[PDB]
Amino acid sequence: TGRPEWIWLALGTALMGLGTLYFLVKGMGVSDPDAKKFYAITTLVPAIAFTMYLSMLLGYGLTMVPFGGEQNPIYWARYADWLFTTPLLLLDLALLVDADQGTILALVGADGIMIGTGLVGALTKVYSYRFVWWAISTAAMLYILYVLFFGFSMRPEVASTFKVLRNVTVVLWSAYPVVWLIGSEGAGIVPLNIETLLFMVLDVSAKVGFGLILLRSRAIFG
Template identity: 25%
Template sequence: MYLLQRSNDAIKINSDIVNGAHADIHITTHGSDVYWAWCSLMGLCTILFFLWAQMRSEGSRLFHNVAAFTSLIAAIAYFTMASNLGWTGITVEWHRTNSHVAGNTRQIFYVRYIEWFLTTPLILSNLFFVAGMSWQSLVQVILVSWILVVTRLVGALVSTTYKWGYFVFGLVTYIYIVYELLFNVRNHATSLGNDIRKAYLFPAALESLIWLIYPIAWGVCEGGNVIAPDSEAVFYGILDIATIICIPALLLFSLRDVDLARLVPSGPRAEAPVEKAAHQNGTNGAGGLDSSEVANPV
C-alpha cells in the first residue's frame, strides 16, 4: 500500500456536464494527466525564466520577464484544462464512427483561446523588441493577432459549416503576421547589426513555421472532429511548449552577449525615424546606422 497514493479525480469532481449540457466527446483521465504534465512544465519554466532574469542587469530583464509571464499564463490555462474546466459543449459538424470521437457534442476548451489571446501579444513583443521595432508597429500586429485568435474561437463555437469561414479569416491574419515577421521586422533587425539579425531570424522563422501547424491542429480537433480530445491535449500541448517555452528560450540564449537595454523602444516617437530608415534601406541599410544612432535617434 502506497503512503501517498497517486490519483487524478479531476474528471470525477468536474464532470462532462456544463450548464446542464452533456459533452459526448470529452477528455478522459489520460487527457487530464497530459494537461497536468504540461501545466507542471509551464510552471517550472516560469520559475526558471524569472531566475534567469535575476541573473541579468535590471535594465536587461524585460525579455526574460515577458517570457516568464507568458509561460505563467499558459500554466494557469493548462491547470484549468487539466481540472476539466473552462470548456463548453458544441454540436459537431462531422459525426464520426470511431468510438473515441463518436457523439453529437464535443468538448471545446475556450480557456485555450483566452490563453492565446494573452500570450500571443507577449511572444510578438519579444520578437519585435529584439528587432528594435516601434510601439506603433507592435500595437498594429497585436491587433491582428487578436483577430486571429478570436476568429478561431468563434469558428470553434460554431456547429455548422460556417465555422470554416472564420478559419479562412484566421489564415489571412496569419499570413499578415508572418509577412511582418519575415520581411519588415527582419529588415529592421538587419539594420541594427549582424548580431541582432542572427538573434532574431531563426526564432522568428521557427515561430512562423510552428504557427502554421496550429490551423492543422484546429482542423482535426475543433473543426473536423477527427482526433479525440485526449490526442488534442497532446497535439496542442506540444505546439504550445514549442512556441511559449522552447523558442523564447532560444531567443534569450541567442541574446546572451547582446546589450538588451538598447533594444527596447523608449516610446512611439523615439523609434519612428530608425524604423523608417530601416524600411527604406532594407537589408542594404546595415551600414547606414551606427549603434549610437539606434540608441539615440534624432
C-alpha cells in the same frame, strides 16, 4: 480523471510551471533594463499558460459545444491563454528588431483578430461556419507571418537571434491551424486526446522552448 486527454493537460501544466520557475530564477539579478523587458515578457508567457493548462486539467477551462449533431468538448481556455501569450511573443520579436509602433500595433491587432476569430470558430454551433472563422483566423496569421518576413542595420547579434526565432515562429505557429482543422474543433479526423497532445507539444515548444532560445542569446542586452 476520466478524460483520457488528462495526462497531456497534466504534463503541460507541469512543464509550464517548471519553465516559469526556471525563467524566474534565471532573471534574478538582471539590471539591464532592455534585458529586463525580455525577461518579463518571457516569464509571463508560461506563467499564464500554467494557469490556463491548470484550468483545463481541473475542468474549468472546458465547455460543451453542440454541432455536427453532438456535444463537442471545447477547451476554451486555450484561447484565453493565446489571447495574451501570442502578442507577448510578438512583442519579444518586435523589441529585438526595434520595430516601429505602427508595425507593433498592426501585429498585436492582427493577432487579436486571429485568436478572437479562432474562439468564435471554436464556439460556433453551425458546422460549416466554423471553417469560415478558421479561414479568417488563418488569414490574420498569414498577415502576421508576412509582416515578420517583409516588414523589417541591427547589430549582427540581434539579426542572428531574430532570424532563428522568426523561423521557429513560422513553423510552430503554422502548425496550429492545421491541428485545429484536423482535430475535434474542425473536421474531427484526429480524436480530442491526440489533439490535446499536439497542442501541448506546440505550446510548450512555442513558449518554453522559444524562451530558452531567446534568454540564452546576448541579443537581449543593451
